[PDB]
Swiss-Prot record, chains A, B:
Subcellular location: Host cytoplasm; Host Golgi apparatus
Whole-protein residues included: 3241 to 3546 of 7073
The protein's role, per its UniProt record: Cleaves the C-terminus of replicase polyprotein at 11 sites. Recognizes substrates containing the core sequence [ILMVF]-Q-|-[SGACN]. May cleave human NLRP1 in lung epithelial cells, thereby activating the NLRP1 inflammasome pathway. Also able to bind an ADP-ribose-1''-phosphate (ADRP). May cleave host ATP6V1G1 thereby modifying host vacuoles intracellular pH.
Domain of life from the UniProt record: Viruses
Species this chain originates from: Severe acute respiratory syndrome coronavirus
Name of the protein in question: 3C-like proteinase nsp5
Membrane topology, Cytoplasmic segments: 1-306
Catalytic site: 41 (for 3cl-pro activity), 145 (for 3cl-pro activity)
Catalytic activity: TSAVLQ-|-SGFRK-NH2 and SGVTFQ-|-GKFKK the two peptides corresponding to the two self-cleavage sites of the SARS 3C-like proteinase are the two most reactive peptide substrates. The enzyme exhibits a strong preference for substrates containing Gln at P1 position and Leu at P2 position
Boundaries of every Peptidase C30 domain copy: 1-306
Length: 306, 306
């Protein structure tokens, strides 16, 4: 039946994207009810980049210093405030398309859909995982700031990311919808760089279970392993240590496939030590770590091929 | 800035998905204006699968034999007709959310976004390419028939695919929005199977240009090649033969990077003959062929890193 990195339908989020302008800078904003959210760096000018004092820069602005455009309509700003690294703009109109929603701060290793947007206009949607080093390997060009990340559950949109900048290695950093950065990054031009990253062990295991659910088990073996012995191998291949909590999480998938978690860990250990010998898993030649146990249960059939 | 397999925002299509029921079978339908489109096999029963005569099966149906549900609203069918492998249901209501649109039959190697849907409710969106063998490697489960594929250009949705079935190897087959199947497949239970497939050479080349545009050129070399000599190597690695037409298409990308097309072909030849030696391109360990020259120009910056 296949397995793809699929994102959530973006319709509910497309109806919330607007354009925010201050000075000569234009970027994206998120319009929910009568509030518009956007990166606070929309108020920076060329000489503010290296060491900006957003408090000082903001006090010098009025409500009309901000221009908010929704489609072909102009929204009047009737108030503004700064919440951490975000700007909260109050507008005279409540978004008619505001969906049921909430703000969530996702944890490292978890996934979400990103709606790439430019000038308040959505251009594409794709899935990505919050890396353990707190960055995401997205696809963003100039003008993409303000684009948001989200998950959708029973018609409720859980926003978890707003794009702010690109680091030296081409990876991206941002904040949650409360303006707090994911990772030790700050919104100013410095020498900051992404820290060392690691493979999301729990997700690789989830993915191996998806492969079995879809009918493939060539990588399994007759061995088992203890968490300790497994982590000795994981540490050598730069994989996150596996904990009992992660083992517990894999419970449902283990049950659906009849493959004990530690037995699957034994399979992973072998794959790491001997490689895949020209073979593929779910079409991949490498071990995928951008699918959480949740993502697998969501996309795969509830009935294993067997 | 990154490179991801990104799909088009699905909002405009989500507003067109409905549920169609006939007998005990329920699947997805596409609602545009006052017409609902869905796979004609929605009228098949267990004993019709092997050798169904849709003409005979359909004449036995009335307008009320069909149930169309849009969200929490029931649409009354006031007419029905069969167009090739599709059923065209006339309804008493015109879809208020019908976007500007058109029906297009895409060509092999081209890409489109798929909005996976179940019971008339969108569940996910992802990109895929129409393989040279006329199938797509999608992700579909029971109840996904009727899900559509599309591309979006300047607010105009070009529908190009409707899902009908899964073949033995787990790949998928469908029709364009005129009900004509892509490939030599038919909507009946038979021993039909996907034919031999090949790698989309033009797309791999497009992808290599994207890598250079993003700042990477470790795979380039000092050689060049003629189309003939290139195709001798391509034929050995099961790649589609490159034609002058394909060379012409790569013109813009060649110009933006300053790398002659045949020179890039020389690079590809080397990569095929010597492998990637543990190196990666745009994060991949293999040669990607699901990105068209159009997809690259769309996602990549217009300014090469250099
Ligand atoms: Hg700034
Ligand atoms: Hg049928």
């Amino acid at each position: 039946s296949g397995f793809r990195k699929m994102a959530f339908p973006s319709g509910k989020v497309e109806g919330c994207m607007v354009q925010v302008t201050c000075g000569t800078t234009t970027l994206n904003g998120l319009w929910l009810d009568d509030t518009v959210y956007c990166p606070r760096h929309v108020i920076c000018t060329a000489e503010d980049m290296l060491n900006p004092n957003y408090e000082d820069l903001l006090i010098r602005k009025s409500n009309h210093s901000f221009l908010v455009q929704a489609g072909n309509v102009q929204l009047r700003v009737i108030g503004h405030s700064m919440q951490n690294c975000l700007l909260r703009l109050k507008v005279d109109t409540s978004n008619p398309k505001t969906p049921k929603y909430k703000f969530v701060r996702i944890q490292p290793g978890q996934t979400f859909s990103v709606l790439a947007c430019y000038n308040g206009s959505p251009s594409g949607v794709y899935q990505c995982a919050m890396r353990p080093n707190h960055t995401i390997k997205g696809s963003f060009l100039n003008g993409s700031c303000g684009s948001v990340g989200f998950n959708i559950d029973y018609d409720c949109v859980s926003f978890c990311y707003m794009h702010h900048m690109e680091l030296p290695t081409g990876v991206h950093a941002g904040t949650d919808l409360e303006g707090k950065f994911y990772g030790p990054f700050v919104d100013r031009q410095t020498a900051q760089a992404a820290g060392t990253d690691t493979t999301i062990t729990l997700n690789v295991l989830a993915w191996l279970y998806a492969a079995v659910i879809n009918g493939d088990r060539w990588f399994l073996n007759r061995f088992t392993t203890t968490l300790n012995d497994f982590n000795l191998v994981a540490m050598k291949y730069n994989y996150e240590p596996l904990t009992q909590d992660h083992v517990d999480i894999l419970g449902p998938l283990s049950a659906q496939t009849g493959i004990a978690v530690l037995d699957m860990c034994a399979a992973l250990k072998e794959l790491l030590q001997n490689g895949m010998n020209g073979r593929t898993i779910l079409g991949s030649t490498i071990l995928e770590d951008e699918f959480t146990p949740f993502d697998v249960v969501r996309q795969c059939s509830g009935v294993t091929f067997q």
